[PDB]
Amino acid sequence: HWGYGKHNGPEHWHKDFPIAKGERQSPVDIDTHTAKYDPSLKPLSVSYDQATSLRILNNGHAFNVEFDDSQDKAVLKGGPLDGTYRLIQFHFHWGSLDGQGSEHTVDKKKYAAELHLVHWNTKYGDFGKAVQQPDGLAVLGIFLKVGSAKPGLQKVVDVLDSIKTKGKSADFTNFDPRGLLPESLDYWTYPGSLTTPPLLECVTWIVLKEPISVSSEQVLKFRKLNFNGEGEPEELMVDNWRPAQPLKNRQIKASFK
Numbered sequence: 616h617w618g619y620g621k622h623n624g625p626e627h628w629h630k631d632f633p634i635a636k637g638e639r640q641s642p643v644d645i646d647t648h649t650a651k652y653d654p655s656l657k658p659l660s661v662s663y664d665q666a667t668s669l670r671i672l673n674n675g676h677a678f679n680v681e682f683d684d685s686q687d688k689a690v691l692k693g694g695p696l697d698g699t700y701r702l703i704q705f706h707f708h709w710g711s712l713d714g715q716g717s718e719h720t721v722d723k724k725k726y727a728a729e730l731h732l733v734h735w736n737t738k739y740g741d742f743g744k745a746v747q748q749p750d751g752l753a754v755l756g757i758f759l760k761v762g763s764a765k766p767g768l769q770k771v772v773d774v775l776d777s778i779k780t781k782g783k784s785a786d787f788t789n790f791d792p793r794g795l796l797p798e799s800l801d802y803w804t805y806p807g808s809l810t811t812p813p814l815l816e817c818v819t820w821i822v823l824k825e826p827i828s829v830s831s832e833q834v835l836k837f838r839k840l841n842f843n844g845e846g847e848p849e850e851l852m853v854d855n856w857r858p859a860q861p862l863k864n865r866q867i868k869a870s871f872k
């Protein structure tokens with residue numbers, strides 16, 4: 616039942632998932648001025664050379680591109696992290712308009728969209744167990760602005776017609792998520808949560824400073840997807856973002872000045 620509308624959107628989630636109001640919820644606004652530079656933060660290590668995409672799914676909240684995470688193929692490590700985290704899926708949040716859509720904000724600035732590359736700590740053996748741990752997940756957040764097309768995104772945009780409605784899936788092999796990365800890997804990092812229910816507080820958030828550019832036509836195709844299932848009245852999949860949540864104790868660290 617949760618969703619992104621007037622009656623079941625983020626303001627209502629706390630009734631089914633009381634952790635919605637917890638001590639380390641995401642996303643947050645990143646105040647770039649108060650984020651602390653940390654010279655001891657390591658470069659982020661993204662090894663996506665051996666990534667095996669399997670499938671793309673409309674889950675009725677977003678679309679997921681899923682990866683084979685049964686061996687250490689596509690891994691995140693270094694940066695603020697202490698272990699190896701395997702890529703399990705990526706998905707996006709986006710707006711009804713180019714002026715909004717990102718979950719994290721940068722000095723209150725909203726980006727047209729936000730990419731989440733979700734990874735789980737190898738120590739916990741699988742994603743299901745990892746989410747029950749305070750360091751179980753590492754999510755790499757990348758902002759999208761609208762200008763130039765991202766050539767590496769087109770393969771994803773062209774299959775969306777095949778997964779229009781809730782519960783549809785399509786095979787989606789040999790997609791290289793390295794084509795979604797910006798140039799710089801400078802990042803902010805803070806401890807947080809899933810941004811959708813179950814809102815589990817198991818995430819180390821690694822948000823890239825440098826946004827990627829996507830074309831107006833690429834993001835327009837995101838907006839043609841549907842929250843509803845195939846038998847049902849059309850509700851465009853738009854505005855599937857959770858607003859910034861209270862920072863509370865937390866400190867956001869920066870890998871850069």
Ligand SMILES: NS(=O)(=O)c1ccc(C(=O)CSc2ncccn2)cc1Cl
Binds near residue numbers: 731743752754808812
């Ligand atoms: N917006 S986000 O924080 O990157 C994010 C959104 C959805 C999910 C899920 O996997 C939800 S499905 C699920 N979640 C917990 C336990 C069993 N299944 C995971 C993440 Cl990290």
Ligand SMILES: [Zn+2]
Binds near residue numbers: 706708731810
């Ligand atoms: Zn997400």
